Structures are given as C-alpha cells and as structure tokens.
C-alpha cells in the first residue's frame, strides 16, 4: 500500500459508506424497491406523491415541494444515521453482536439496520451468530441469500463484502 492507500481508511467512516450505497438526489425519486426517497437514502413513505412530499415538508420543516438542498440532506442523512445507531444499541439481540465486531464491520452494521431497520436486522438469527462467532465467509453467503441483497443487489453488495472482510476495499475505485 502506498502512504496515500494507508490513509484512505482515516477518510472512510459510516457517513461516507453510506453516501456512497445511498448516493445523494435533492428530489424525491423512487428507489430500486420503487419506494419514495430523497437525499441521502431517506425513506419518505413505502405509492402516493402527495404522501412523499408531506412526509418531506414534516422531516426538513419547511414547505419543500419535493425538493432540499445539500446542506438540508445533510442533516437529515445525520438523522437517519443517528436512529440506526440508537436502534442497534438500545437493542437486546444487536447491541452485543455490534459490541463484538471491530470498528469497521460495526460501520457495516449501522449501514444494514440504516437500509433494513432493526426488526429486518435481528430476525437474520443465523448472520447474527456468525458475526458474533467471527464465521465471516458464512456470515456473507447467508446475507447474499437475503431478499435485501436480491431485490437491490448494488445498494447492498458493498455492506456484504465489508461484513466478510472488515475493510474499505469495497468502497475504494469507484
């Protein structure tokens, strides 16, 4: 690895793993499951417009007609990110797998109860114990059987390879 390769670990962490999975749209669209989404993977609602665009002006706080900005997405991206952690660690079954895992496969943690919320999460009984258990190659053969990873391969590929390896390579050359 190069002195600049060695760094780029210290400019990887949750907010930019998810950038990345998530990407960064100012106005509403349709995710790959065809639910309605803005900013930084934001799920407004799981088929009516008009419902999205509520739900937007009720999270940004102001009358958006399905348009933020950049810093707007931001600081709700910081939200979302906010609940998951909250989510795991307030959670009896998540809290002591996530406790077990380093720091980066606790950045992948993060990202899959972000996408999936807890209770999708911590009904994945076996990749649950294989994490603990350090089975990593289980752990991603089992997570690519899941309807989250079929349905919308690219959103998820990238937390799967990130649980078997632990590192940022995933995410490297885009």
């Not at 906010?82 to 795991?88: H, K, L, N, T």
Request: aromatic share 10%.
């Amino acid at each position: 690895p190069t002195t600049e390769n060695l760094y780029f670990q210290g400019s990887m962490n949750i907010f930019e793993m998810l950038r990345i999975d998530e990407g960064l749209r100012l106005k509403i669209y349709k995710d790959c499951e065809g639910y309605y989404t803005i900013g930084i993977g934001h799920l407004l609602t799981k088929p009516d417009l008009n419902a999205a665009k509520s739900e937007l002006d009720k999270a940004i706080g102001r009358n958006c007609n399905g348009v933020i900005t950049k810093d707007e997405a931001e600081k709700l991206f910081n939200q979302d990110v906010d609940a998951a952690v909250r989510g795991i660690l307030r959670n009896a079954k998540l809290k002591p797998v996530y406790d077990s895992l380093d720091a980066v496969r606790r950045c992948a943690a993060i990202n899959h109860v972000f996408q999936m919320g807890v209770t999708g999460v911590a009904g994945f009984t076996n990749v649950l114990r294989m994490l603990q258990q350090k089975r990593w190659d289980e752990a991603a053969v089992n997570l690519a059987k899941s309807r989250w990873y079929n349905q919308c391969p690219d959103r998820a590929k990238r937390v799967i390879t990130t649980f078997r390896t632990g590192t940022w390579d995933a995410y490297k050359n885009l």
